[PDB]
Amino acid sequence: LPPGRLATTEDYFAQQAKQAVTPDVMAQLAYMNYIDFISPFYSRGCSFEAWELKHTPQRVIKYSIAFYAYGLASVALIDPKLRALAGHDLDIAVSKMKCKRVWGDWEEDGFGTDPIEKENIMYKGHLNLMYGLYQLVTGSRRYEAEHAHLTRIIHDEIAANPFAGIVCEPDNYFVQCNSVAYLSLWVYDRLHGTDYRAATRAWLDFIQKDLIDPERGAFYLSYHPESGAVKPWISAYTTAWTLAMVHGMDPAFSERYYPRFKQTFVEVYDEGRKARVRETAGTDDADGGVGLASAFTLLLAREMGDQQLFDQLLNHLEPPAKPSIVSASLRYEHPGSLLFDELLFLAKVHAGFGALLRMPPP
Amino acid sequence: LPPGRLATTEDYFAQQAKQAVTPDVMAQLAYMNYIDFISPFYSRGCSFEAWELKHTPQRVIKYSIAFYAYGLASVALIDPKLRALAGHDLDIAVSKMKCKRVWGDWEEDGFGTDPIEKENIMYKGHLNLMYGLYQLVTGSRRYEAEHAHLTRIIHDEIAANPFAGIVCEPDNYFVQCNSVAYLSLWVYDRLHGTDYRAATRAWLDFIQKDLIDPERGAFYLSYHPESGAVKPWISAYTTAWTLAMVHGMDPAFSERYYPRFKQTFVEVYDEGRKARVRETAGTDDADGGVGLASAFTLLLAREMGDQQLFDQLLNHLEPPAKPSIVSASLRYEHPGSLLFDELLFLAKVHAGFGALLRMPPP
Amino acid sequence: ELPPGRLATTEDYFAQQAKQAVTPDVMAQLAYMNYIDFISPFYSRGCSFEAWELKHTPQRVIKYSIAFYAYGLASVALIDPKLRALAGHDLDIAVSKMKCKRVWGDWEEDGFGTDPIEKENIMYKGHLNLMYGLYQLVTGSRRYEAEHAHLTRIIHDEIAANPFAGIVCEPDNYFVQCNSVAYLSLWVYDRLHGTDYRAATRAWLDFIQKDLIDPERGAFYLSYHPESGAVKPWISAYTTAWTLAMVHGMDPAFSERYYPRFKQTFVEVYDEGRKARVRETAGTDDADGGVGLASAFTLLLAREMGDQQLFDQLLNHLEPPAKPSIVSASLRYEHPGSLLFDELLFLAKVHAGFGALLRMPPP
Amino acid sequence: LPPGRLATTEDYFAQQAKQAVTPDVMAQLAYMNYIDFISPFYSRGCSFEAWELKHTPQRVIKYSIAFYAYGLASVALIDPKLRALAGHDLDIAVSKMKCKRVWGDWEEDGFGTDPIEKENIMYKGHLNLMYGLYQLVTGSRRYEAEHAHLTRIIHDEIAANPFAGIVCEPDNYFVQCNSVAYLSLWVYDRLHGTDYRAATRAWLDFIQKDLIDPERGAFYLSYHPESGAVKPWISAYTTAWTLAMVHGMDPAFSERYYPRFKQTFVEVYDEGRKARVRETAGTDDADGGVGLASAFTLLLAREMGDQQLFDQLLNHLEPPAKPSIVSASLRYEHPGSLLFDELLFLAKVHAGFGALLRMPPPA
Amino acid sequence: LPPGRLATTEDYFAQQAKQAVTPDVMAQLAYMNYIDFISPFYSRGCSFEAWELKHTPQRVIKYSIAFYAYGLASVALIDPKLRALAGHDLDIAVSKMKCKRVWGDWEEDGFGTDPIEKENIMYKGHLNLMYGLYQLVTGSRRYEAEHAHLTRIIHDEIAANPFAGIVCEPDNYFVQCNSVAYLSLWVYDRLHGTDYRAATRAWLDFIQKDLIDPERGAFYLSYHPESGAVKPWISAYTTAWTLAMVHGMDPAFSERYYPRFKQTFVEVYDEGRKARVRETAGTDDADGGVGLASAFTLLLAREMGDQQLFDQLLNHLEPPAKPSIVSASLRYEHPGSLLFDELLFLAKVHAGFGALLRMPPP
Ligand SMILES: [Cl-]
Ligand SMILES: [Cl-]
Ligand SMILES: [Cl-]
Ligand SMILES: [Cl-]
Ligand SMILES: [Cl-]
Ligand SMILES: [Cl-]
Ligand SMILES: [K+]
Ligand SMILES: [K+]
Ligand SMILES: [K+]
Ligand SMILES: [K+]
């Protein structure tokens, strides 16, 4: 047990086998659920005090809710005794996800008054996946009508575009946001025996043709269909996220690029005990850009079963954040980045997006 | 004596026998009533400067008023010469309780424009108990029509639910919020010879199934009837509050669990002189969560006639709060928690909820 | 002899009316009130309150601040005939500002209604009514005559229709000091018009001497609450000082009776007789608790009762720590000790007695 | 050349004879005109960044613009090569003067939504005078209709009032504000051959009646028609401003009171090297009240051709304000008062209000 | 390589031959493009977080956007592999340029609700050049309709005025703002084969006879048609900007005045290694007024092929601003003026306004 760590990497990877979350993961669930009014998963309502206290920028809240929801789905898998709870939290996640505080930047930016009609795939992709994960966990048909509507919007929009996928802001295409949307199609198919996921092959072909540097195993920052532009910089956090979720749809894809990605962005240090991730090429700096390179790589390492890298990244990320457990509840005194406890939570419990996809009934 | 205590425990428990409140209680009543414009009970108006000066969060104001009200009800029982004053203050309590500042979080959260028509038992439970306590204290029929209306709302909603009781926010069930509502049914019955309280039996049975840990004498945090989830943490403040209220309706219920509760949560320290209460299991930390576990156990100790625990808790709670009496009015320089002077006032004077329920007329 | 931080002697203040001249520091207070464009409190009839913002007056207190200036001004007019025109001008501005929504708006914000004079709210409309009258008394102007008569009718009818003697402030809140202002306003109206609205005063003085006063301690209780019959069980010095002072203008024997009991209950002489402090309530040693105005209003009461020794003692307590200075012939205080500080010190230095204001010569 | 001074007094008084402004006056025109967006005369639009930067209070902006305008009118008279610039700036001045940022205090105070209809001579007096000076300087008829409209309003209001002149705020009469309005009438007559200025004799008679203290040669602060009150304090800045403008209409008037004014208010110090001005009587403090006594006396000294007092006042005002010229543009590090660079500019170029009236016609 | 410099002047002037931008220019494009939400060219929405982080005053945003855009047009000409990206960024520039946050000052100042209808050539001149440069780079007709509408407005307004050109604020005439407008006509003619540029000769004759001091090679500050007033100060930033753009339309004109301009305003110092520019005559102070003399003279030196002055100016401007490259992205610790990174960016890549006019079709 490394100094400033709460549990061993072995303990995290063993949770499914044990059918029990680690104590610190339980304490994170306590943070998420325990205290009236200010815990993030206290209420269905449009109250965002937990995110206010964390100083989460408005635009980041949707992702915060999304990654919490994904971690919750894995908890449901790990411990049957917490599955009812995880499902309750997922219900709340979907409710909050639909509040105007969360999706409102779309309207404020001038893009329209409806966040799902088109193009907000950074938002509606996550929402569609959450609809799905909720139903897999709980078997409830509470959101089935909305799930169907949103899934058709997504499929149709994919089908109509000359490129494979959907944009975020108009004329902005992000490979990582698309992989949420496609993953959500796989989940809808599992629930209903449909074949929306058929679109995935063209998408995987497309992103491999111009959006990736195959040699370095890294995706370019973004693509912009009307100009044809592919932004010249490769992005680690973008690649880590995308490979993690693609791994749940096409494992050979991610297994192909994963060791090249590591070669390109990952800096092991401190005699092998720790690792840092560079955000782009031509630099020595770790976690530039949005600062999420190391955290998303922590999730990718978990998805790929790479326990050594996971242990290395966590040894870098968690200790300076200064974790403590007070009254059986987890706090970080110095969160190192945006989405910090969210991504650390997700990575600690992540069962694989492939496993989430094929979740047992009840 | 101890140091920073204002009166002995024997003195607080003797108030009803002596038909006189202690001087620190009178000094608390002065804080509540004395200074123009800024004392809590200055006018029926929708002005909350007293609460602004205390930095009371908006969501907590409804509870502050309610617990002031319950304490004033006992004051009425203790000293006949103060019963008119207590009744006046209860009249102001009810009026302020109905101000949008107090219940407006229900509408801001997106739950509805009307705070009593469905759910929201956290608010309308207290309001209905207050309607009844005002009438018991004063004999006045000023709110009788509103009282009948809300009592029937609560009665109908109980009858209509598959689970025993009523939710607060949609799909959030709390045992302590329900105990207020049921107790309000008993008060209505006492005033009108009705039998709304018959529903209590089913409620007491229900909360003793999945909502309690019978051996530890501790309730779980909450229940969520849509998903069936019971949140896996036991909660001291929740249990102390619930047992205190239930003791006025089914004393054997509370008498049965009270010693186990103490075993579970209460830490005696300083060679028997003091006591502090853990909020949940699996920690050594006292007063986590909302931080009210000791303050509510103080009220419970009073309700159960446990003078030893009362004394121990007050020695923990009151001295670090640095009480002073300036111009015959009580102030605490460092309130240790939310609802601090409200809960200490209430505990000091509390005659027992059964006694309040059987209050003789004016 | 002039105490160490004082601006003028007590003898000088009590002599002003005799010499027909305000003291220099009273004149400098009037400069503060009138001199500097835009920010002086009596600069214009407009609904600007920058003077009060610069003083950090809380909103609910502005009406009282305006009212107590007005009462001081009425005495300046009685003291110095050359300043009577000025005094009347400031009273004109006081009435105008009194009617601005910034001043009475708390009534609507507390949910009590959109019209501040229609019913109740005697804490506001009592003062307004007295000010209407003092204005016409001082100036002879009939500018506010129509609304003066209208409000006097409101107050008269409200008193007639209430089971208890008087009128509430907030609904179900009855305050003896606020009522004293309203009744006095009826005396002023009668002085102006020869009428007999003041006839209700007898029943009121009988009422408040029942459950509202502790006759032995010469002190009023905090408040009365008619729907429950409650009388708050604390006696209040500022309440009593203010009430006795204004009642002395209508029934001087009432205040003669309770004044020495009041002093025994509340007043603490200290510093070898040189100073005095006023305790706000019973059962405490602490001075000026509660609203913090006990000493300030007793200062007014001492003036009204001609008690120069007590006046001198309180002013020695109140004025020096506040550090008065005169800059460019205008008075400032560096550390005002309480709300309404320069208002009440001004009023007490010029106060001619409410009875004498009633007998003010015509023009 | 004293330290902290930019040019000699001789240099300022010689500008007109030499047909050129001094270099510091040019540097001041640069501050006024040079920098995109933030210079005060950059744009005709309703932008007030320059005044925000100087922390000009909203109520004072109208006087700032106006005093700039009066100085620009003298620049036109001093230097024919700057007359086009001067006129362009005066165009902008009139245009900004009409923005709601500038006159809106009239509506906020609750005095009405139209700032020229009645009263408010503090605002529309300067506006009318500016309309006039703009047209004297440029010959442009851009504002003729508005100018004629306002001039009739002002004329009809004077004709209708019992007192000679027009109030500012309701029931507030100020002589200095009236002096601008009357001067604006002289300018209108000079442009149009009319005789609106005929009302000046009645006005000069009236202000000499109860508004002035003959011995001290000083006006009282203000007059209030309703109560008849005349505020009992004399004001230096009020007198300086008024005597300067009246000197343009009736020089014997200002000549009669000027030496009296100086004995009352002006303190020469530093062995005759400096002077400063007291704001009211019975104080030794200089520049109390609004703090403009010295700055306006500087203008008065110029108007009266009193080079010695001008030099003394400027030695008092300019050095501690730390003038520097950076990139050919004037800045003061520590302006000692409101309207500081406006009033120093105006005093440094002022050709006399009488000379402004007799301006040679436009091409 | 001088101390504090990122690249040699040789390197900047060689970019077009190498068909590659220097690494620091690429790091500037990263600042403009890389980080989600906060980079200035992230999306075409009406969000200006980038400029809020820079504390760009509102009135200055439009020139920021315009000078970025001109910079991007030269990137497109320099590096074919970056032309698609340059096109995408220009699309975003035009989009944000039309946002009310950018032109709104026109309405707030009381000048009207329509920012292009009449006057305001300071805004719509830049907009019109940007329309054309966008279409030159991309070939897209996305804005062609509004380009034609605005070009006609400018054309009709020039034809209707007694003086040659168009005012900014009513009655305010600026030679630099007019120069942008005339250049925009040349760009429109290149795209459509029209002859709008014919009005240029009358403009050049007029500004040369009336608004320039031929001896000093310097334009006066501004002209005011109604009063006939010409502000009596000459302005370096005004002149540097105007000669730079005129050089794209009439190279002989600017060549005539350029050596005189430098004589008047440019101070060489530090043994010929640095230079700084006085904003006006009769002073020794450099960069007074708007503080842009040196930065615009840097652009002008680039336009005129003057590598010596370019190097001297850049040695003055860049080192005290303390450039650094973090995570392959350029940041200045201490920008010495408004529009700082925009104008250094533009000067470093600027291929000449004449070269832009002759841009190959893609
Ligand atoms: Cl946390
Ligand atoms: Cl105690
Ligand atoms: Cl308290
Ligand atoms: Cl004061
Ligand atoms: Cl300045
Ligand atoms: Cl930068
Ligand atoms: K609760
Ligand atoms: K009161
Ligand atoms: K004035
Ligand atoms: K410009």
PDB file of C-alpha atoms in Angstrom, chain B residues 61-204:
ATOM      1  CA  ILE B  61     -35.532  27.976   7.881  1.00  0.00           C
ATOM      2  CA  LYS B  62     -38.658  25.753   7.882  1.00  0.00           C
ATOM      3  CA  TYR B  63     -37.001  23.507  10.473  1.00  0.00           C
ATOM      4  CA  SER B  64     -35.811  26.415  12.594  1.00  0.00           C
ATOM      5  CA  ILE B  65     -39.355  27.764  12.858  1.00  0.00           C
ATOM      6  CA  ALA B  66     -40.793  24.339  13.607  1.00  0.00           C
ATOM      7  CA  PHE B  67     -38.420  23.499  16.429  1.00  0.00           C
ATOM      8  CA  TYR B  68     -38.915  26.991  17.944  1.00  0.00           C
ATOM      9  CA  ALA B  69     -42.623  26.235  17.791  1.00  0.00           C
ATOM     10  CA  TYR B  70     -42.278  22.874  19.587  1.00  0.00           C
ATOM     11  CA  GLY B  71     -40.222  24.501  22.330  1.00  0.00           C
ATOM     12  CA  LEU B  72     -42.770  27.306  22.760  1.00  0.00           C
ATOM     13  CA  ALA B  73     -45.491  24.652  23.148  1.00  0.00           C
ATOM     14  CA  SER B  74     -43.693  23.287  26.215  1.00  0.00           C
ATOM     15  CA  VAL B  75     -43.100  26.794  27.566  1.00  0.00           C
ATOM     16  CA  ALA B  76     -46.903  27.122  27.563  1.00  0.00           C
ATOM     17  CA  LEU B  77     -47.132  23.993  29.719  1.00  0.00           C
ATOM     18  CA  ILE B  78     -44.370  25.087  32.121  1.00  0.00           C
ATOM     19  CA  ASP B  79     -45.551  28.607  33.064  1.00  0.00           C
ATOM     20  CA  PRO B  80     -49.223  29.723  32.840  1.00  0.00           C
ATOM     21  CA  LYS B  81     -48.079  33.363  32.912  1.00  0.00           C
ATOM     22  CA  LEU B  82     -46.093  32.747  29.716  1.00  0.00           C
ATOM     23  CA  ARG B  83     -48.816  30.841  27.902  1.00  0.00           C
ATOM     24  CA  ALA B  84     -50.215  33.975  26.233  1.00  0.00           C
ATOM     25  CA  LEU B  85     -46.740  34.934  25.024  1.00  0.00           C
ATOM     26  CA  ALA B  86     -46.068  31.386  23.780  1.00  0.00           C
ATOM     27  CA  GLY B  87     -49.356  31.459  21.929  1.00  0.00           C
ATOM     28  CA  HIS B  88     -48.508  34.816  20.365  1.00  0.00           C
ATOM     29  CA  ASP B  89     -45.137  33.437  19.185  1.00  0.00           C
ATOM     30  CA  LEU B  90     -46.785  30.281  17.794  1.00  0.00           C
ATOM     31  CA  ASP B  91     -49.137  32.520  15.837  1.00  0.00           C
ATOM     32  CA  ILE B  92     -46.136  34.283  14.325  1.00  0.00           C
ATOM     33  CA  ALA B  93     -44.477  30.877  13.699  1.00  0.00           C
ATOM     34  CA  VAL B  94     -47.387  29.668  11.632  1.00  0.00           C
ATOM     35  CA  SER B  95     -47.577  32.883   9.627  1.00  0.00           C
ATOM     36  CA  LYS B  96     -43.862  32.930   8.843  1.00  0.00           C
ATOM     37  CA  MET B  97     -44.044  29.183   8.027  1.00  0.00           C
ATOM     38  CA  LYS B  98     -46.337  30.048   5.127  1.00  0.00           C
ATOM     39  CA  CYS B  99     -44.019  32.630   3.516  1.00  0.00           C
ATOM     40  CA  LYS B 100     -42.557  31.744   0.138  1.00  0.00           C
ATOM     41  CA  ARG B 101     -39.068  32.432   1.507  1.00  0.00           C
ATOM     42  CA  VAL B 102     -39.658  29.407   3.723  1.00  0.00           C
ATOM     43  CA  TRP B 103     -41.191  26.860   1.318  1.00  0.00           C
ATOM     44  CA  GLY B 104     -40.001  28.338  -1.993  1.00  0.00           C
ATOM     45  CA  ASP B 105     -37.251  25.717  -2.468  1.00  0.00           C
ATOM     46  CA  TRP B 106     -40.058  23.324  -3.447  1.00  0.00           C
ATOM     47  CA  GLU B 107     -40.802  25.495  -6.504  1.00  0.00           C
ATOM     48  CA  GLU B 108     -37.203  26.435  -7.307  1.00  0.00           C
ATOM     49  CA  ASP B 109     -36.274  22.709  -7.403  1.00  0.00           C
ATOM     50  CA  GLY B 110     -38.961  22.184 -10.063  1.00  0.00           C
ATOM     51  CA  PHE B 111     -41.337  20.179  -7.851  1.00  0.00           C
ATOM     52  CA  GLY B 112     -44.448  22.378  -8.113  1.00  0.00           C
ATOM     53  CA  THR B 113     -45.889  25.829  -7.369  1.00  0.00           C
ATOM     54  CA  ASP B 114     -48.021  24.462  -4.524  1.00  0.00           C
ATOM     55  CA  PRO B 115     -46.093  23.263  -1.435  1.00  0.00           C
ATOM     56  CA  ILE B 116     -48.799  21.236   0.305  1.00  0.00           C
ATOM     57  CA  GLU B 117     -50.893  19.573  -2.420  1.00  0.00           C
ATOM     58  CA  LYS B 118     -48.665  16.465  -2.744  1.00  0.00           C
ATOM     59  CA  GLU B 119     -45.431  15.097  -1.236  1.00  0.00           C
ATOM     60  CA  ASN B 120     -43.157  17.590   0.597  1.00  0.00           C
ATOM     61  CA  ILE B 121     -44.004  16.076   3.979  1.00  0.00           C
ATOM     62  CA  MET B 122     -40.726  17.595   5.278  1.00  0.00           C
ATOM     63  CA  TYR B 123     -42.536  20.950   5.021  1.00  0.00           C
ATOM     64  CA  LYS B 124     -46.224  20.255   5.395  1.00  0.00           C
ATOM     65  CA  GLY B 125     -45.779  17.757   8.241  1.00  0.00           C
ATOM     66  CA  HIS B 126     -44.262  20.440  10.470  1.00  0.00           C
ATOM     67  CA  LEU B 127     -46.845  23.007   9.300  1.00  0.00           C
ATOM     68  CA  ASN B 128     -49.709  20.701  10.256  1.00  0.00           C
ATOM     69  CA  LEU B 129     -48.240  19.898  13.685  1.00  0.00           C
ATOM     70  CA  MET B 130     -47.818  23.646  14.174  1.00  0.00           C
ATOM     71  CA  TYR B 131     -51.445  24.392  13.248  1.00  0.00           C
ATOM     72  CA  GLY B 132     -52.473  21.947  15.950  1.00  0.00           C
ATOM     73  CA  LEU B 133     -50.034  23.081  18.613  1.00  0.00           C
ATOM     74  CA  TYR B 134     -51.125  26.700  18.150  1.00  0.00           C
ATOM     75  CA  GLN B 135     -54.774  25.756  18.726  1.00  0.00           C
ATOM     76  CA  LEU B 136     -53.992  23.545  21.730  1.00  0.00           C
ATOM     77  CA  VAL B 137     -52.018  26.359  23.291  1.00  0.00           C
ATOM     78  CA  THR B 138     -54.410  29.237  22.574  1.00  0.00           C
ATOM     79  CA  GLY B 139     -57.892  27.813  22.051  1.00  0.00           C
ATOM     80  CA  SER B 140     -58.058  30.031  18.957  1.00  0.00           C
ATOM     81  CA  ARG B 141     -59.746  28.796  15.768  1.00  0.00           C
ATOM     82  CA  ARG B 142     -57.809  31.209  13.564  1.00  0.00           C
ATOM     83  CA  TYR B 143     -56.270  28.464  11.389  1.00  0.00           C
ATOM     84  CA  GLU B 144     -58.912  25.796  11.876  1.00  0.00           C
ATOM     85  CA  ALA B 145     -59.960  25.709   8.201  1.00  0.00           C
ATOM     86  CA  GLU B 146     -56.379  25.449   6.911  1.00  0.00           C
ATOM     87  CA  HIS B 147     -55.675  22.837   9.599  1.00  0.00           C
ATOM     88  CA  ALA B 148     -58.582  20.660   8.474  1.00  0.00           C
ATOM     89  CA  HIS B 149     -57.619  21.071   4.810  1.00  0.00           C
ATOM     90  CA  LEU B 150     -53.993  19.985   5.314  1.00  0.00           C
ATOM     91  CA  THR B 151     -54.899  17.169   7.729  1.00  0.00           C
ATOM     92  CA  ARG B 152     -57.186  15.699   5.084  1.00  0.00           C
ATOM     93  CA  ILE B 153     -54.418  16.058   2.475  1.00  0.00           C
ATOM     94  CA  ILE B 154     -52.063  14.041   4.679  1.00  0.00           C
ATOM     95  CA  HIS B 155     -54.744  11.473   5.560  1.00  0.00           C
ATOM     96  CA  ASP B 156     -55.678  10.921   1.886  1.00  0.00           C
ATOM     97  CA  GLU B 157     -52.079  10.678   0.694  1.00  0.00           C
ATOM     98  CA  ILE B 158     -51.289   8.092   3.371  1.00  0.00           C
ATOM     99  CA  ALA B 159     -54.339   6.032   2.395  1.00  0.00           C
ATOM    100  CA  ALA B 160     -53.300   6.157  -1.279  1.00  0.00           C
ATOM    101  CA  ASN B 161     -49.684   4.981  -0.920  1.00  0.00           C
ATOM    102  CA  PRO B 162     -48.545   1.323  -1.145  1.00  0.00           C
ATOM    103  CA  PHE B 163     -45.842   2.081   1.457  1.00  0.00           C
ATOM    104  CA  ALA B 164     -46.937   3.521   4.858  1.00  0.00           C
ATOM    105  CA  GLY B 165     -46.580   7.306   4.869  1.00  0.00           C
ATOM    106  CA  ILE B 166     -45.593  10.092   2.509  1.00  0.00           C
ATOM    107  CA  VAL B 167     -42.488  11.180   0.617  1.00  0.00           C
ATOM    108  CA  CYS B 168     -40.572  14.446   0.884  1.00  0.00           C
ATOM    109  CA  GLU B 169     -39.041  15.133  -2.496  1.00  0.00           C
ATOM    110  CA  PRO B 170     -40.457  12.786  -5.157  1.00  0.00           C
ATOM    111  CA  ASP B 171     -39.286   9.183  -4.434  1.00  0.00           C
ATOM    112  CA  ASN B 172     -37.504  10.191  -1.185  1.00  0.00           C
ATOM    113  CA  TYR B 173     -38.984   8.675   1.973  1.00  0.00           C
ATOM    114  CA  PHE B 174     -37.682   9.769   5.387  1.00  0.00           C
ATOM    115  CA  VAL B 175     -38.802   8.129   8.615  1.00  0.00           C
ATOM    116  CA  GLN B 176     -38.256  11.300  10.734  1.00  0.00           C
ATOM    117  CA  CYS B 177     -40.291  13.571   8.457  1.00  0.00           C
ATOM    118  CA  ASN B 178     -43.133  11.075   8.618  1.00  0.00           C
ATOM    119  CA  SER B 179     -43.060  10.976  12.407  1.00  0.00           C
ATOM    120  CA  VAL B 180     -43.944  14.708  12.448  1.00  0.00           C
ATOM    121  CA  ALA B 181     -46.893  14.106  10.127  1.00  0.00           C
ATOM    122  CA  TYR B 182     -48.325  11.204  12.117  1.00  0.00           C
ATOM    123  CA  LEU B 183     -47.912  13.120  15.361  1.00  0.00           C
ATOM    124  CA  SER B 184     -49.816  15.968  13.708  1.00  0.00           C
ATOM    125  CA  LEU B 185     -52.660  13.484  13.121  1.00  0.00           C
ATOM    126  CA  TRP B 186     -52.811  12.667  16.848  1.00  0.00           C
ATOM    127  CA  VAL B 187     -52.988  16.376  17.670  1.00  0.00           C
ATOM    128  CA  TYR B 188     -55.834  16.888  15.223  1.00  0.00           C
ATOM    129  CA  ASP B 189     -57.717  13.959  16.797  1.00  0.00           C
ATOM    130  CA  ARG B 190     -57.197  15.374  20.286  1.00  0.00           C
ATOM    131  CA  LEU B 191     -58.732  18.669  19.151  1.00  0.00           C
ATOM    132  CA  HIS B 192     -61.674  17.215  17.234  1.00  0.00           C
ATOM    133  CA  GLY B 193     -62.433  13.756  18.624  1.00  0.00           C
ATOM    134  CA  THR B 194     -61.591  12.282  15.213  1.00  0.00           C
ATOM    135  CA  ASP B 195     -59.542   9.171  14.477  1.00  0.00           C
ATOM    136  CA  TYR B 196     -56.999  10.175  11.836  1.00  0.00           C
ATOM    137  CA  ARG B 197     -54.348   8.632  14.081  1.00  0.00           C
ATOM    138  CA  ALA B 198     -55.554   5.087  13.312  1.00  0.00           C
ATOM    139  CA  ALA B 199     -53.045   4.988  10.411  1.00  0.00           C
ATOM    140  CA  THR B 200     -50.162   5.040  12.900  1.00  0.00           C
ATOM    141  CA  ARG B 201     -50.275   1.294  13.533  1.00  0.00           C
ATOM    142  CA  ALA B 202     -49.467   0.353   9.949  1.00  0.00           C
ATOM    143  CA  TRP B 203     -46.759   3.014   9.898  1.00  0.00           C
ATOM    144  CA  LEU B 204     -45.026   1.682  13.040  1.00  0.00           C
TER     145      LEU B 204
END
